[PDB]
A paper describes a structure:
The Very Low-Density Lipoprotein Receptor (VLDLR) is an entry receptor for the prototypic alphavirus Semliki Forest Virus (SFV). The mature alphavirus virion is approximately 70 nanometers in diameter and has T = 4 icosahedral symmetry. Trimers of E1-E2 heterodimers are organized into 80 trimeric spikes on the virion surface.
However, the amount of VLDLR is much lower in vivo, leading to binding modes that might differ from the resolved states. The structure was resolved to 8.8 Å (bin4) using icosahedral symmetry. Furthermore, a block-based reconstruction algorithm was utilized to optimize the resolutions of 2’ symmetry axis region units to 3.41 Å. At this resolution, both the receptor distribution and binding interfaces can be identified. In this binding model, LA4 was situated between LA3 and LA5 and has no interaction with E1-DIII of site-2. However, due to the space limitation imposed by the binding of LA4, LA3, and LA5 can’t attach to neighboring two E1-DIIIs positioned counterclockwise. The structural analysis of the LA3-5-SFV complex at a lower stoichiometric ratio, along with the structure of the VLDLR-SFV complex confirms the LA binding models and unveils multiple states of VLDLR binding to the virus during the natural invasion of the host cells by the virus.
Residue numbers in the entry:
A (entry chain G): 196 to 244
B (entry chain F): 1 to 438
C (entry chain I): 267 to 422
Write the structure that this text describes.
Amino acid sequence: QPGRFGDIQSRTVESNDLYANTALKLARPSPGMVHVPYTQTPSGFKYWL
Amino acid sequence: YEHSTVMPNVVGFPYKAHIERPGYSPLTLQMQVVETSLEPTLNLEYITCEYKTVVPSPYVKCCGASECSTKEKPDYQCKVYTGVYPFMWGGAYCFCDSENTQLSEAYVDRSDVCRHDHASAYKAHTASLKAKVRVMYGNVNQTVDVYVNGDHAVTIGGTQFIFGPLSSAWTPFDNKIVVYKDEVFNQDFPPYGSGQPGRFGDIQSRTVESNDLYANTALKLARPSPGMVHVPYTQTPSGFKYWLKEKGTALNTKAPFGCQIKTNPVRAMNCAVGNIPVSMNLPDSAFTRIVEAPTIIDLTCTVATCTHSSDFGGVLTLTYKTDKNGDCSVHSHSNVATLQEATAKVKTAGKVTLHFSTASASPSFVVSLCSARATCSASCEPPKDHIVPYAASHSNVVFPDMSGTALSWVQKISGGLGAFAIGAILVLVVVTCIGLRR
Amino acid sequence: VPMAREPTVIHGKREVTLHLHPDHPTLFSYRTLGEDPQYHEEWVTAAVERTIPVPVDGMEYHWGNNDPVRLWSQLTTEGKPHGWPHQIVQYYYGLYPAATVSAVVGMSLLALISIFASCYMLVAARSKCLTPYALTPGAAVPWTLGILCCAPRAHA
Ligand SMILES: *[C@@H]1O[C@H](CO)[C@@H](O[C@@H]2O[C@H](CO)[C@@H](O[C@@H]3O[C@H](CO)[C@@H](O)[C@H](O)[C@@H]3O)[C@H](O)[C@H]2NC(C)=O)[C@H](O)[C@H]1NC(C)=O
Ligand SMILES: *[C@@H]1O[C@H](CO)[C@@H](O[C@@H]2O[C@H](CO)[C@@H](O[C@@H]3O[C@H](CO)[C@@H](O)[C@H](O)[C@@H]3O)[C@H](O)[C@H]2NC(C)=O)[C@H](O)[C@H]1NC(C)=O
């Protein structure tokens, strides 16, 4: 679940697959700018730490 | 054709009114309260802002004595100090060693930007309500702006509507109000002329442009230190700044019934309480002659699925027999179930379906299509979802029908016990009558 | 000014468990939009977790600079309506868990009073109708003996 331990998981260190669920959502850019805004729930590993 | 009704004061509720003229086909109007606004009546009391202490330069009299003079300034203070021997950067003037006198003067004045950052103290009474209602029927849409008191009639497509006074008399604003920028506080401010130092309204101005000022901040002067020229003083800090720091709460985040407070002018919008009576007056052209409308006979109502959820979670089917296809004006004659539509297309096939919303375990209501009638009863299962982001579309009535499962069980049990009691009474009366007949 | 992230809502039974992740001190406040509101406001600083009540009237919460969001609870319960008599009570106990108990108690006491009164009437009638033949050494009239169970089954 986003925001808690294990929001992204991998089978092993060198594994190619990856599961990520962090609630990444894009927003409409402001008029007269080029900046591709977004919002995202912070890292779960850091908050576990 | 005069008609009257009462509609709930809930924003977005799909209220539908059924109008039955015995000589014509029935009509269904859809009225909806898009927006309200509850405006009170205000009387400005005074204006508070931060103060500014004005301290003019001291007057040191070399070799002499000076006399204090009184002035008409807000919170004026003046004193004369004897025996001063001041100093300046290059040398100590007033050659006389000890025959000198210093005069200290200070007074309070309204701040520089008091006309840009100030709080107003009001008195609120006899609020007046306003609305913005959308009315659609037949082929006429359109939203109008009305006063909700039985003294404003607005014409919508040839029909006159008067929205009667609100059922209740509830206003979230208390008697005394303090307004700051975009916030309303239910406060009990001190009357003009009796503020106190260090708290709200230490300085009170009758109007932002008023010349008169009443200031009370315990300004005091103290004797200057030897060998200095500074005019010391002590003063209790501003009351406006401390009111800003510890005003506490608001009315925007505390008002009951879920209604927004706003400012300029003060008003409480979309504030759900009470009922709104309505009076109409329709012309003869709004109705349709009974010859034109289709005839409906043998109306039977069955309920496919029922679920007492906030959305429209019930489905209803009507079977009939008709001579020609056209339109009818459906309606539900009890507020247990609120239908979704006010018109339905009837056809020679003999089947039409309607959607309703209910909040009771077992509803029982009578539904009519054009001129027909039918009684519907159903059994409804609760919803599985815990929370939804939209308000309820039912009238929130929960008492089940007397033919429902629970009340049938109660009836059967009570009937059994009553039969037992009646048998006992009959046996005892028979025994006493046998005793008497002898 | 910046707009803070949307919190994560987890739905419960008339409750919302709400996960808050701020970067700088943001103001969080909510109120229950009924007749008597439940007011609260706070300066959330670190990553916290809040539980807030959502009655059938609904409520709104204001997180940072975002627009207020309103949530309404829905008439959900755990009993089984239209079932056995002990399931309708559960259904109407999940909803309104304070009048169901009172109504059930009242109905039960009424039933007990009625049944005790009826049993008393039968006992008194039997006593009245079996004492007249019980003051003399007379025949119990086997026709009457079978119909009503008196003290002597066969002995006189
Ligand atoms: C120049 O400096 C001298 C001081 O060295 C100043 O003389 C002082 O003048 C004031 C008033 O003009 C005197 O104050 C009062 O004088 C009366 C006189 O009878 C006395 O009764 C009071 O008790 C009080 O002292 C002061 O005594 C006097 N000082 C002296 C004479 O030493 C003079 O005023 C200065 N020049 C100007 C233009 O001010
Ligand atoms: C009576 O008039 C009102 C206002 O003209 C009608 O409501 C309007 O209905 C249209 C059709 O759905 C809405 O247009 C669409 O709205 C959605 C909402 O998200 C939007 O995403 C679409 O891009 C499109 O704009 C319109 O917004 C809506 N207006 C309002 C103020 O709600 C109403 O339907 C009319 N009644 C009848 C019976 O026609």
